[PDB]
Design a protein around this ligand. Structure first.
Ligand code: A1L0L
Ligand code: CA
Length: 258
């Protein structure tokens, strides 16, 4: 696999706050086309090859600051991470989906040469919290060539997602009362195609805002999902299949094996 980066993983390595790569940043003006700008986190070391990229959207009435801890943590494992701001704080999930795509197109077409030279434009992914998680679902319908999708405590009014063909990892929060898992996260997961590589992880005692602070349970499996599907890195299947049994997880579902 020409896309494998970093040494062979252990459960300690995927739980490490800092991965094998050092990270630099690049700020993007809000006058970028089609989204509200943001911050690009990228691995500095270039001798292992180019990397895939993930655009990360915040929730309703939130900014990239609520998602900033994903920047260095995920990028240090070998990824370009773009925490974006939206055009307005009130943008809906469909709008956030379009803006995740515009952020990715920015990386491919308009980003700084330091980012462009490190990017593989064929291996892109989306992630989002709350309404941004609904935008992550929307973006996969809008661009089926995406490699992975991670809706974090997602909010969306539409409960059926049977046309998604992008591998999708939904994280729910047990005590979420803003986007309850019974009416958002779980219906979304169950409506994804039964043949799709997918998973649902519910966090014990977590609130709707659990994704907004550093969480090792979230981070270790976000890293494993992006490795498995953006990098085609089967070295990380061991952490995804069979279903994780971490104490912080109160329910896990998957279409393992993959
Ligand atoms: C029904 O009330 C609303 O307008 C509404 C407000 C927030 C969200 P959500 O994005 O999931 O949480 C915010 C995370 O920054 C969904 C709907
Ligand atoms: Ca703009």
């Amino acid at each position: 696999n020409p896309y494998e980066r970093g040494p062979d993983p252990t459960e300690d390595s995927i739980e490490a706050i800092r991965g094998p790569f050092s990270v630099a940043t690049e700020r993007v003006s809000s006058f970028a086309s089609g989204f509200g700008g943001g911050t690009i986190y990228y691995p500095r070391e270039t001798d292992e090859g180019t990397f895939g990229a993930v655009a990360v959207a915040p929730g309703f009435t939130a900014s990239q600051g609520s998602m900033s801890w994903y920047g260095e943590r995920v990028a240090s494992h070998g990824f370009i991470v773009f925490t974006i701001d939206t055009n307005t704080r009130l943008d809906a999930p469909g709008q956030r989906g379009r803006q995740l795509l515009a952020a990715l197109d920015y990386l491919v077409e308009r980003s700084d040469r330091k980012v462009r030279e490190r990017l593989d434009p064929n291996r892109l992914a989306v992630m989002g919290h709350a309404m941004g998680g609904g935008g992550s679902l929307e973006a996969t319908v809008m661009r089926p060539s995406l490699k992975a999708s991670i809706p974090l405590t997602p909010w969306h009014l539409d409960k059926t997602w049977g046309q998604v063909q992008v591998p999708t990892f939904i994280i729910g929060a047990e005590l979420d009362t803003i986007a309850p898992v019974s009416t958002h996260a779980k219906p979304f997961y169950e409506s994804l195609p039964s043949s799709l590589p997918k998973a649902y992880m519910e966090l014990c005692g977590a609130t709707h805002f659990a994704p907004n602070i550093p969480n090792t349970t979230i981070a270790k499996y976000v890293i494993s999902w992006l490795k498995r599907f953006v990098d085609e890195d089967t070295r990380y299947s061991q952490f995804l299949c069979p279903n994780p049994t971490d104490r912080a997880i109160c329910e896990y579902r998957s279409t393992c094996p993959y």
